[PDB]
From Swiss-Prot, chain B:
Miscellaneous comment as given in the Swiss-Prot or TrEMBL entry: S-II binds to RNA-polymerase II in the absence of transcription.
Disease per record: A chromosomal aberration involving TCEA1 may be a cause of salivary gland pleiomorphic adenomas (PA) [181030]. Pleiomorphic adenomas are the most common benign epithelial tumors of the salivary gland. Translocation t(3;8)(p21;q12) with PLAG1.
The protein's name: Transcription elongation factor A protein 1
Keywords: Acetylation, Chromosomal rearrangement, DNA-binding, Isopeptide bond, Metal-binding, Nucleus, Phosphoprotein, Transcription, Transcription regulation, Ubl conjugation, Zinc, Zinc-finger
Family in the record: Belongs to the TFS-II family.
Disulfide bond residue pairs: none
Subcellular location: Nucleus
Subunit details: Interacts with EAF2. Associates with UBR5 and forms a transcription regulatory complex made of CDK9, Pol II, UBR5 and TCEA1/TFIIS. Part of TBP-based Pol II pre-initiation complex (PIC), in which Pol II core assembles with general transcription factors and other specific initiation factors including GTF2E1, GTF2E2, GTF2F1, GTF2F2, TCEA1, ERCC2, ERCC3, GTF2H2, GTF2H3, GTF2H4, GTF2H5, GTF2A1, GTF2A2, GTF2B and TBP; this large multi-subunit PIC complex mediates DNA unwinding and targets Pol II core to the transcription start site where the first phosphodiester bond forms.
GO molecular-function term, one example from the UniProt record: zinc ion binding
CC annotations in GO: nucleolus; nucleoplasm; nucleus; transcription factor TFIID complex
Organism in which the protein naturally occurs: Homo sapiens
Record-annotated TFIIS central domain positions: 9-125
Swiss-Prot record, chain D:
Record's disease association: Neurodevelopmental disorder with hypotonia and variable intellectual and behavioral abnormalities: An autosomal dominant neurodevelopmental disorder characterized by profound infantile-onset hypotonia, developmental delay with poor speech, delayed walking, and impaired intellectual development. Additional variable features include feeding difficulties, dysmorphic features, and visual defects.
Outcome of mutating Y401H: In NEDHIB; uncertain significance; moderate
Annotated segments matching region Bridging helix: 124-165
Name of the protein in question: DNA-directed RNA polymerase II subunit RPB1
Source organism per UniProt: Homo sapiens
Cross-link (Glycyl lysine isopeptide (Lys-Gly) (interchain with G-Cter in ubiquitin)): K560
Recorded superkingdom: Eukaryota
Free-text comment about domains: The C-terminal domain (CTD) serves as a platform for assembly of factors that regulate transcription initiation, elongation, termination and mRNA processing. The trigger loop allows entry of NTPs into the active site, switching between an open and closed state with each NTP addition cycle.
Stretches the record annotates as Trigger loop: 375-416
Effect annotated for changing N543S: In NEDHIB; uncertain significance; severe; no effect on cell viability
Effect of L416P: In NEDHIB; mild; decreased cell viability
Localization per record: Nucleus; Cytoplasm; Chromosome
Swiss-Prot record, chain E:
Quaternary context: Component of the RNA polymerase II (Pol II) core complex consisting of 12 subunits: a ten-subunit catalytic core composed of POLR2A/RPB1, POLR2B/RPB2, POLR2C/RPB3, POLR2I/RPB9, POLR2J/RPB11, POLR2E/RPABC1, POLR2F/RPABC2, POLR2H/RPABC3, POLR2K/RPABC4 and POLR2L/RPABC5 and a mobile stalk composed of two subunits POLR2D/RPB4 and POLR2G/RPB7, protruding from the core and functioning primarily in transcription initiation. Part of Pol II(G) complex, in which Pol II core associates with an additional subunit POLR2M; unlike conventional Pol II, Pol II(G) functions as a transcriptional repressor.
Function noted in UniProt: Catalytic core component of RNA polymerase II (Pol II), a DNA-dependent RNA polymerase which synthesizes mRNA precursors and many functional non-coding RNAs using the four ribonucleoside triphosphates as substrates. Pol II-mediated transcription cycle proceeds through transcription initiation, transcription elongation and transcription termination stages.
Disulfide partners: none
Residues of the full protein shown: 246 to 392 of 1174
Record protein name field: DNA-directed RNA polymerase II subunit RPB2
Organism listed in the record: Homo sapiens (Human)
Curated annotation (Swiss-Prot), chain F:
Family note: Belongs to the archaeal RpoM/eukaryotic RPA12/RPB9/RPC11 RNA polymerase family.
Zinc finger (TFIIS-type): 82-124
Originating organism: Homo sapiens
Nucleus keyword on record: yes
GO biological-process terms attached to the record: maintenance of transcriptional fidelity during transcription elongation by RNA polymerase II; transcription by RNA polymerase II; transcription initiation at RNA polymerase II promoter; transcription-coupled nucleotide-excision repair
Name of the protein this chain belongs to: DNA-directed RNA polymerase II subunit RPB9
Zinc finger extent (C4-type): 17-42
């Protein structure tokens, strides 16, 4: 997603920043879904589901 | 002593090298023998060429041309006073001459313009935006193609030339 | 002036044929493989009496693969364009020497009657023909080109048996293909192409010569 | 920014701008204003995206990626920017003008097609018409691309249709010839593959050793009783130490082969299963706490991976050739599988238990065995549509060239059509020469090779020519040369009575002559060699202020005694001197000898991924350098020149590659060229499809264009 | 070959579907202006510039083989008309084509053969300007040149 | 001679026969050791005034102050300038322009034409 500070923000405290999406055991833990999560992407939720 | 010779063509080439050394009468003020030196030069050239070929003849003339330059009488004066030994004069391998105050600059300037011909053909695709998630550099290019589109909308394509890496905006 | 290049070239083509002899397996000296330019210049003592028949002297023999079945013979003609007359004498020379294969390196081109005559030589001793310019650099070192290894007729028999194919059904390669020419292979022989693969890492193919 | 453009126009009219490399001064100027206007659009574009509030629905559509994009926000809120047509600013339609509403020759932004307004404020009348011009190029492009791609796709399917994977899993066409021994070289399915990272390409040999090696000396950090459980009891085992030491020995050898396979240093490969996501599925379900101590025996891991390696059948057989086929075909998945499931990796990072690992082995076995492609399938047809589809996507003649040189390597569909036809005469053939190490870090060595490679004809080197009547040089009409004539009294002193009284004098440009680093004796020797001894040449010193060359023509002396009637039909020598003057120019090929037209544009590459080398630390490194890029084809000879790289020198022209490097080298080069054209959009067509395409065209030695 | 090593001056003319190209100076001689000084004047009546005049010079030299209007008419006829026998109808046939089909818009009669020659010459001049680069090429789309 | 010279020897591409009014061609006189010009269709002949018979390229006849007529000063579409002083007449106001030609004279440099009837003078800056 546009969010945060590519290349150096996640390395700055992981102040969860909520941007990055994490799903675990079939439950959405954090983040916001977009075309990169849901779209025709190589690693989208939809691809993994199939 | 000057090395013995008998060939008439070699003798006349020495005479011409001597005659070229006579230019501007600098030989008088220095008082150096132009006939012994011209012979030593010619011997040294002949020691290189080993015959009286066109290539030797061209070399004799270019040696002559160096002596007869109007803008650099100091080259001759350097040869006349022994600052340049005949064996060195015999070879143009040590460059060509650079005491005329401008042509050397110009050749340097030529060396600049062909080096100017190297500088970057024409740099571009710098916009300089997003940071790469591989080689950690911001030097990046973006591509804008297919307007409106059929069903793959004018998405923004960003490529890191720095390591041939490409990702999309969102 | 161009004469001075020549020495680099004569060094350079001799070295490529050595690798060529070495890949075919004709056992050249490691030192000949290792031979530098400075040594070669030293070997013919450069600089004197140019245009001298160094190449007639450069003519070399090379001695046998795993089984000393005579040898292979390498000939550098002095003539820019070689005609049948030089070939006929050379033929007298190969016959006297009783050699089994002859490689000729011509400096510009061969007359078509000579190629014809070369075509007629096919039953007896084999004659191989390289254009000096294509030989002047080792093409097999180039990055595009994967490792080629020739197989014996027995190995081909086992290959066709184990996959259950016909000779006709394999991928083909030109008899004039620069690489096929490099090994000097004839029709019916198979080459094993070994490639790097993005997805297999290594991939092995075969090509029947056509 | 507008004041800054007026400022650059003011500099340009002063005649002092100083041009950019390889470009005319207008191009330098045009490249500069274009840089300023683009920077102007992007600066205000970045200002508008900042200025948007959280609640902008327009930003909410852009961010989900639903429809539309950043540039649209730029155009509606900010400023629309420079329009262009055919990749250049709006042409001068009328005499030196775009519209009669402007002054003649007015290079300003607005006057030549920059739109200062946003769609929201509305366009001014000229901007609207220059915008309507920008509107056509896209409508027309649409109508053409639909016709061409419809044709390219049909031809492609029509070739490959009968190829298909047979039940012994070799891929063969209609007459039953083999295309591939295994489909896609591994026999996997394209819909079951995934992108994966190769752990063993990890930089630094020391770093690899640290992260992978299972230590036995045990650093005082909980005597093996940390992480592992009962494994503290097998620390005294000699056999277990030697077997793992054997494992690490395979990993150094695999790491060495894998470095040969991927010289560029990319870790992204398509492979089945995605072993890492599975370990995560495995950890998550069994409720594995990574802080709690382990419960897994290392030998169980090593042997289990061996057994799994044997279970992953892709080539059934038993004789030495089947074992080699099995081993080599799934080499890349196998080295990956050992790297992921490594004992030290398993114990430290993934913390899996024994039950979880045994289950994990069972799923990878089931997924890998399911991944193998289904024989019967139509593979040939499958590939043609996956190739056909990107020709559908984008670019017909749009210019996005960022390789700091000529437009070369034509982009998009017309280039695809060339690879598809194997055109004996491409519209724009090319060739990339890389340079030997020393000559690549130095400019002056690079300049000397560059001049040797270039092909220039004496006509280019000549400033001017003249033909003079001068029977008596000793009293020549050109009094300044008179000093040279005395200089050349001994220059064959006798046949001056015999040579023709007709004189050709040539003057050479000083900068251009020097640039080629030529000397006069080279020219004299070249021209003497071309025309013969009959062509009697003399020349002045290369250091005179007016660099000049003088040409006469000598006859055959003895035999020319008016025998019959002169077998020349009494051709005047002046008229003949023009024919000599014409042909002397058009023929003389010093240094470069054939068709590289102009031959060059020197480049510094630091941007790309070139010269990737290994270092003694173990890691990969960048090596910036000079490389020569040419616009012509002569690969056979150009390879043999000195200090030219005999390894990485390449050409985009597949017919010349065929002549020099044979059919296998075509198979690769054509793949790279087809991969490279698809890669411009970077939609990433799966490689297995292009391998199949290349194999069909190169199947039978001779090139089989799909025409 | 060894003729003069220069094809980039050889100006010729296609007349309307004449089976063969004709050199332009021959056309001028067919119009009757046999004097080269006059032909040159008709091409460019501002002979202060040696460069363009030199540019046409080899085509005048090429024309030299014939210097009579009748012969030049018979020449164009043979270059036009299928093979036959008599010369004289060929001259007449060639004459009516040269008169009526050569730029009809400038005239269709004998009494305006001279004026037509002037228009051919401005046309050759119009051509020479582009080859020197003194004048930009015409645009293939400029609506000013459409009806 | 001297570096600060010029090469305009007077390329006389025109010297027609005084009688038949056609072009003269060079031809040798070995007897007199002199170039002569003769008409081919007749005997008339006359000696040359120069030793030259042909030249080619100058490469830089930058051609900056020729062909372009002063009257271009009238054209309303050309930019009038407030920049002053014709270098001939003590009057400001000049029309200027550039290249206007195919010898793509990478000549970006401006050419200025004085517009008042007193000069018609054409310089460059
Ligand atoms: Zn990067
Ligand atoms: Zn006359
Ligand atoms: Zn004035």
């Amino acid at each position: 997603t546009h969010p945060d500070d590519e290349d150096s923000g996640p390395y700055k405290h992981i102040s969860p920043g909520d941007t990055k999406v994490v799903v675990e055991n079939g439950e959405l833990i954090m983040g916001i879904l977009c075309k990169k999560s849901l779209g025709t992407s190589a690693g989208s939720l939809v691809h993994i589901s199939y | 002593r000057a090395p013995s010779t008998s060939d008439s063509v070699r003798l006349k080439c020495r005479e011409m090298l001597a005659a070229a050394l006579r230019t501007g009468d600098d030989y008088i003020a220095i008082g150096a023998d132009e006939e012994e030196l011209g012979s030593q030069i010619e011997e040294a050239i002949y020691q290189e060429i080993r015959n009286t070929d066109m290539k030797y003849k061209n070399r004799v003339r270019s040696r002559i041309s160096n002596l007869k330059d109007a803008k650099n009488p100091n080259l001759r004066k350097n040869v006349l006073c022994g600052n340049i030994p005949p064996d060195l004069f015999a070879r143009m391998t040590a460059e060509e001459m650079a005491s005329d105050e401008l042509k050397e600059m110009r050749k340097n300037l030529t060396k600049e313009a062909i080096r100017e011909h190297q500088m970057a053909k024409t740099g571009g695709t710098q916009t300089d935006l997003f940071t790469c998630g591989k080689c950690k550099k911001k030097n990046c290019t973006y591509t804008q193609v297919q307007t409106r589109s059929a069903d793959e909308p004018m998405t923004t394509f960003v490529v890191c030339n720095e390591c041939g890496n490409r990702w999309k905006f969102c | 002036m161009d004469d001075e290049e020549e020495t680099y070239r004569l060094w350079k083509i001799r070295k490529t044929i050595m690798q060529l002899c070495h890949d075919r397996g004709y056992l050249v000296t490691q030192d000949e493989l290792d031979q530098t330019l400075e040594e070669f210049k030293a070997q013919s003592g450069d600089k004197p009496s140019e245009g001298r028949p160094r190449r007639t002297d450069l003519t070399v023999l090379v001695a046998h693969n795993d089984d000393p079945t005579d040898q292979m013979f390498v000939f550098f003609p002095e003539e820019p364009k070689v005609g049948i007359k030089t070939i006929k004498v050379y033929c007298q020379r190969m016959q006297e020497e009783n050699i089994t294969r002859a490689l000729i390196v011509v400096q510009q081109g061969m007359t078509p009657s000579a190629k014809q005559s070369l075509v007629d030589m096919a039953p007896k001793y084999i004659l191989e023909q390289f254009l000096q310019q294509e030989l002047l650099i080792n093409i097999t070192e180039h990055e595009l080109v994967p490792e080629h290894v020739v197989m014996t007729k027995e190995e081909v028999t086992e290959l066709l048996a184990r996959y259950k194919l016909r000779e006709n059904q394999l991928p083909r390669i030109q008899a004039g293909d620069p690489v096929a020419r490099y090994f000097g292979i004839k029709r019916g022989q198979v080459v094993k192409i070994i490639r790097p693969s993005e997805t297999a890492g290594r991939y092995i193919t075969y090509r029947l010569v056509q | 920014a507008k004041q800054d453009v007026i400022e650059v126009i003011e500099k340009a009219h002063n005649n002092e701008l100083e041009p950019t490399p390889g470009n005319t001064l207008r191009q330098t100027f045009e490249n500069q204003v274009n840089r300023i206007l683009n920077d102007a659009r992007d600066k205000t574009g970045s200002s508008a995206q900042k200025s948007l509030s959280e609640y902008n629905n327009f930003k909410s559509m852009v961010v989900s990626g639903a429809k539309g994009s950043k540039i649209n926000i730029s155009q509606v809120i900010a400023v629309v920017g420079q329009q262009n047509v055919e990749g250049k600013r709006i042409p001068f339609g009328f005499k030196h003008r775009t519209l009669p509403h402007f002054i003649k020759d007015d290079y300003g932004p607005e006057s030549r097609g920059f739109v200062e307004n946003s769609y929201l404020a509305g366009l001014t009348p000229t901007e609207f018409f220059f915008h309507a011009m920008g509107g056509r190029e896209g409508l027309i492009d649409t109508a053409v691309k639909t016709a061409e791609t419809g044709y390219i796709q049909r031809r492609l399917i029509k070739s490959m249709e009968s190829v298909m994977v047979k039940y012994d899993a070799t891929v063969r066409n209609s007459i039953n010839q083999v295309v591939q021994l295994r489909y896609g070289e591994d026999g996997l399915a394209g819909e079951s593959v995934e992108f994966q990272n190769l752990a063993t390409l990890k930089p630094s040999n020391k770093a690899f050793e640290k992260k992978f090696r299972f230590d036995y000396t045990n650093e005082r950090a909980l005597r093996r009783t940390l992480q592992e459980d009962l494994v503290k009891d097998v620390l005294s085992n000699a056999h277990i130490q030697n077997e793992l030491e054997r494992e690490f020995e395979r990993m150094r050898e695999d790491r060495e082969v894998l470095r040969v396979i991927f010289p560029t240093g990319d870790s992204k490969v398509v492979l089945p299963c995605n072993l890492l996501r599975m370990i995560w599925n495995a950890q998550k379900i069994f409720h594995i706490n990574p802080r709690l101590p382990s419960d897994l025996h290392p030998i169980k891991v090593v042997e289990g991976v061996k057994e799994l390696s044997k279970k992953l059948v892709i080539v059934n057989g038993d004789d030495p050739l089947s074992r080699q086929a099995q081993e080599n075909a799934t080499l890349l998945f196998n080295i990956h599988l050992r790297s992921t499931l490594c004992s030290r990796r398993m114990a430290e990072e993934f913390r899996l238990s024994g039950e979880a690992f045994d289950w994990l082995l069972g799923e990878i076995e089931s997924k890998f065995n399911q991944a193998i492609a289904h024989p019967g399938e139509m593979v040939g047809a499958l590939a043609a549509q996956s190739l056909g589809e990107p020709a559908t996507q984008m670019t017909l003649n749009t210019f996005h060239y960022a390789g700091v040189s000529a437009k070369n390597v034509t982009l998009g569909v017309p280039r695809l059509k060339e690879l598809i036809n194997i055109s004996k005469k491409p519209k724009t053939p090319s060739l990339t020469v890389f340079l030997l190490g020393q000559s690549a870090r130095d400019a002056e060595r690079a300049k000397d090779i560059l001049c040797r490679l270039e092909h220039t004809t004496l006509r280019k080197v000549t400033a001017n020519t003249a033909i003079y009547y001068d029977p008596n040089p000793q009293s020549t009409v050109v009094a300044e040369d008179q000093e040279w004539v005395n200089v050349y009294y001994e220059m064959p002193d006798f046949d001056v009575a015999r040579i023709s009284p007709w004189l050709l004098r040539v003057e050479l440009d000083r900068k251009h002559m020097t640039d080629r680093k030529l000397t006069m004796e080279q020219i004299a020797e070249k021209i003497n060699a071309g025309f013969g001894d009959d062509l009697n040449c003399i020349f002045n010193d290369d250091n005179a202020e007016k660099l000049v060359l003088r040409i006469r023509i000598m006859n055959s002396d003895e035999n020319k005694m008016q025998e019959e009637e002169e077998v020349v039909d009494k051709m005047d020598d002046d008229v003949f001197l023009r024919c000599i003057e014409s042909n002397m120019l058009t023929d003389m090929t010093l240094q470069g000898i054939e068709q590289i037209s102009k031959v060059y544009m020197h480049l510094p590459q630091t941007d790309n991924k070139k010269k990737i080398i290994i270092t003694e630390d173990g890691e990969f490194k960048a090596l910036q350098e000079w490389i020569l890029e040419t616009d012509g084809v002569s690969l056979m000879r150009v390879l043999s020149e000195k200090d030219v790289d005999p390894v990485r020198t390449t050409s985009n022209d597949i017919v010349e590659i065929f002549t020099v490097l044979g059919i296998e080298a075509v198979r690769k080069a054509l793949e790279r060229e087809l991969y490279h054209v698809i890669s411009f959009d970077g939609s990433y067509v799966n490689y297995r499809h292009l391998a199949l395409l290349c194999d069909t065209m190169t199947c039978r030695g001779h090139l089989m264009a799909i025409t | 070959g060894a003729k003069k090593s220069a094809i980039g001056q050889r100006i010729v003319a296609t007349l309307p579907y004449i089976k063969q190209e004709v050199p332009i100076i021959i056309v001028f001689r067919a119009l009757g202006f046999v004097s080269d000084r006059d032909i040159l004047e008709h091409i460019i009546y501002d002979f202060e510039d040696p460069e363009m005049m030199e540019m046409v010079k080899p085509s005048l030299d090429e024309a030299f083989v014939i210097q009579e209007q009748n012969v030049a008419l018979n020449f164009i006829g043979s270059r036009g008309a299928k093979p036959g026998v008599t010369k004289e109808k060929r001259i007449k046939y060639a004459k009516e084509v040269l008169q009526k089909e050569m730029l009809p818009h400038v005239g269709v009669s004998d009494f305006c053969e001279t004026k037509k020659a002037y228009f051919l010459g401005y046309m050759v001049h119009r051509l020479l300007l582009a080859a020197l680069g003194r004048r930009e090429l015409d645009d293939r789309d400029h609506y000013g040149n459409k009806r | 001679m001297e570096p600060d010279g010029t090469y305009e020897p007077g390329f006389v591409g025109i010297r027609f026969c005084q009688e038949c009014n056609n072009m003269l061609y060079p031809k040798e006189d070995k007897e007199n050791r002199i170039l002569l010009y003769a008409c081919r269709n007749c005997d008339y002949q006359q000696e040359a005034d120069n030793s030259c018979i042909y030249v080619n390229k100058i490469t830089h006849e930058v051609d900056e102050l020729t062909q372009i007529i002063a009257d271009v000063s009238q054209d309303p579409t050309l930019p009038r300038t407030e920049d002053h002083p014709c270098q001939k007449c003590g009057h400001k106001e000049a029309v200027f322009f550039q290249s206007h030609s195919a010898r793509a004279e990478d000549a970006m440099r401006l050419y200025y034409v004085c517009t008042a009837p007193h000069c018609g003078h054409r310089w460059t800056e």
